[PDB]
Symmetry: D5
Subunit: 140 residues, 10 copies
């Protein structure tokens, strides 16, 4: 269609539309157990996470009513911090969100919040530890 971001599947848009204030969506990397965890699965194997996050932030406001609307997955000790978080931070600040609302959950904590999320979008993102949890806010 005209005016809608080009990297959003028909089904993704529907689920973004039907999501209400408080509903969470996981943007999972190519390595995340998306199918096994998901309440509702959306497959987007041909899309990396930076470009997808940008489009969703364009469309979907974030929950200001909580302290933490965005969550990443904290690494296991010995593993390196993915540099991709810098792209996320750069993007998140872009659509005028305060970077303070990001918090870090550990692997098992993350796995569990994704199960309670309304949908997981399986991406093709190769970067390790690239999983993002987004919480929908109120629409103006």
């Amino acid at each position: 269609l005209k005016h809608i971001p080009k990297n959003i599947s028909p089904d993704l848009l529907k689920t973004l539309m039907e999501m209400g204030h408080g509903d969470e969506i996981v943007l999972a990397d190519a390595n995340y157990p998306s199918a096994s965890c998901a309440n509702k699965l959306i497959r987007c194997d041909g899309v990396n996470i930076p470009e997808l996050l940008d489009s969703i932030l364009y469309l979907m406001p974030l929950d200001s009513y909580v302290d933490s609307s965005i969550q990443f997955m904290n690494v296991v000790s010995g593993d390196d911090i993915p540099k991709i978080w810098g792209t996320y931070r750069q993007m998140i600040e872009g659509h005028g969100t305060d970077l303070k609302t990001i918090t870090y959950l550990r692997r098992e904590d993350f796995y569990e919040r994704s199960k309670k999320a309304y949908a997981i979008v399986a991406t093709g993102e190769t970067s390790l530890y690239a999983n993002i949890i987004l919480k929908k806010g109120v629409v103006v």
Copy 2:
């Protein structure tokens, strides 16, 4: 159809009809997480709540055997009391329903009750904290 309100959808009327004494129905605003909470989902994305409440009250009696047959979602203290509540109130009293039956639920409590409800209709009501739970009476 003749003699039936024009803003009650086919599927909404079916579900109102099959509802029994005690069953609850949520009238959710545009911002409510309707789809994620619904046991049974009706979308009326083009209808506003006062208008839909009016039609529902005409058709469906409210539960006399409980202290509270109506619930709103309570605001965070001490934020502004939603203006539309007045509209609702003036319509609830009118169908002959005592205002002292309305009750206010914490966001979390409201969510939990909506999951146990028979159905949630998702409306286009743009106003905040505009949600309502209704409990069916006897006919």
Copy 3:
């Protein structure tokens, strides 16, 4: 519910509502092969057709845009003209459609039309050749 005839079921009211101008519904007697002809089946095995026709006529205008809004199934020339037709004619008139709209269809014509109808209603009408096809009109 209030203001809605007590002899119209949840599913029947839904289908009456979603019917539009021209759609046909079949009030079928107990002997009619409703299930095998039905595009969409609605069972009301405890209801008779007089009651039902009355309630339906109350909510749903007939099709003014054709010669025939109503069709009974004809007998096999001409053994015992069914008494129940008389009861139908009384209601159909003073509701208030013109009795001249009723045409009578051959068995195999009726069967065939009933398959092209939107829905059939299986009733408990024990009378013979008691079936009816009604055509929805324009609501204004």
Copy 4:
């Protein structure tokens, strides 16, 4: 069909047939939350309960292996004790069942039992507190 009562529906018969020793079936009045409680829902919106109870008892024996094979719904004070109970009792004896088998569950207890029942039939019964639960017996 011949030799089968005319007011029990196709899916109703299959249901009574497939029930076995110990299974319960609720015959619910027009005000019961049948749809929302039913494990399995049979709709008979045109039928009243006394005629239905008569047909079922004809086909289905009641459980002798428990002290209560029938339950009614008790009134909340101050509602009227419905007259229909008298019709029910009069009809339950006359099939030969000892009226001592009838017990009286309060509203909330009744709902919870109907939930663990194999099937609920939503009737057209207008009388209040006209709900019945029947427990299937042994055949031989």
Copy 5:
């Protein structure tokens, strides 16, 4: 249940009641391609046809409005006239139906009609050419 013949399964009785006037049902021996022909399939692999025929004709009237209300499968010329046809005739007479109504179809016509019937019941009947096609009549 009480008053229902013991060899009519729950789903068979249902389909028998769902059937209207003119509807056909095929009683298929254990060599018939039941599953591949059936619009709707009922399996009674442990039942033989003559006893099934008895119960069905007991419960269901035959179509007395057409030339043939019953069809068997004619043998491929040469092969023996199956004995069971005798047993069927002594079954059909009794229940008061005239054997003049039995017509005989050839394999590829018997297959064709069975596809258009409302149901095929697959039985355990080991005898050859034991297939019967039944047409439902009026219930009064």
Copy 6:
């Protein structure tokens, strides 16, 4: 969501999205046989068609590869020409579509084309002969 017309329901947007070039969609009025004709049914019982037409024209280009990308349902005499057709014509021109693309179908023909359409949306439009068929055009990268 932001930047999306607020009268386009979640399922309608999906179906507008999954439509490609040549696909058609029917905006059916309240009296229309939407449910019986529909390959794929979307119910928007609370929406009027001019509102919906503006939002759809905003997002979805019309098919330039055919003469008629828009069809109305012609009247039988003596029904009146509906006023809403002006409203539609006003709307269509202004999104940049030549009114020459509008053609008119006999009630009967309209029904049959609606059965071959990708989707019918049932609206709350009480105005008569208010049905439209729109045929999706190519979306070209700027």
Copy 7:
């Protein structure tokens, strides 16, 4: 089919086959509540248990890794220990199983174990307390 007991239905064979070591299948008499207890239901309404048990014991080895691979339903006083238990033991002995493997479960314990069984088959066995639970062993 050749070389396959005639009294095993298409769907029963498949269930027996997809059962692994330790899975249980219940052979239920005509009075049992099979439909309501079953995780997976197979209907063999025209077959008695004796015949069926023989075929199943011909095809399916019994679990030798537990104390008891066969459970009958024990009676409640004062009912009679049914004669069919005699018929069961050889077949059972006759297929080579040590009868000490038969353990007896009371009514409620039987229903609960059957709810946990991979499948229940509803038979036509009019005899009482004829239900049997079988536990599949290892093949070679």
Copy 8:
């Protein structure tokens, strides 16, 4: 299970059982468009055709009412004659079936007969032109 050939899956045996006189099942090599042509699809991707032909010939009698019970795919007039046909012919006379019942179809005719067949089993057979159509006969 005991007394069942070991290379027939649970679903294959069921489909082999529910087939009746005249039904056709296709044994398709790894390269055959099984998924697209199948009315009913059974997958046996780890199984070669000769051993499957063995078991099926053992369990399933072939149709004697036709001159041709078996169809191979004939080669494209350019391609080479497959070794596997000799295997097949030897397999076919071993059970008492005359090789004169074998016929050969050109791809087009083969594709079409397969669509009209009750089932296609997609096998792992590597040999080209390895496909077989078997038509079931009567069990006595």
Copy 9:
């Protein structure tokens, strides 16, 4: 996974594997009516056709039993020959296919063949007339 091209969704791979000789798959551009035309629909809204074509040709042989294993959609009138046709041509040669196997279909004929294809994959390819139909060959 290791060794599988990174831009193939789990479902596309399945589709590719279950396709056999002669089956056709349509790589559809972002303007194609993919959903209304597809018998089986795989969405890859995040992939462009060149990268998809490349990894598909790696896995899947083309049908050499026909003059044309590849079909493009010829432009109307009218507009330019898209440059991506050069890109496809450079890839098709290199994987070892004779470019003469490419034929060009009029818009309506392409649509019609795609209705007959096993599957259509909806890509995010923004180039016009970028659609490709591939026919599967034999393997190894």
Copy 10:
């Protein structure tokens, strides 16, 4: 398809692909209760476990983030150590994985683990105690 192990079924490949880091898959022997334990069942009745394990190890890396990514079912000792274990070890070491990751689970613990596995693949492995639980690692 080319470059893909020949013993991986279309849905198995899909399953392996849709699995993510941490997801488990049971390779279950012919005696295992796959059907009854399986959250998601893939049937591969024709295939043995070593050839299948080998192919899967080629495609799927094992989880490095736990102390044990491979589990066998331990013997009831009771029975003796099955020789199929060494064959497994020869394989998993040949794929670069350290044999100190194999743990051993008791029969009941293995059943429970398998219920919580993403998929169970039912094999034709005739070796006893031959079941394997693989846990998927990260792909770099």
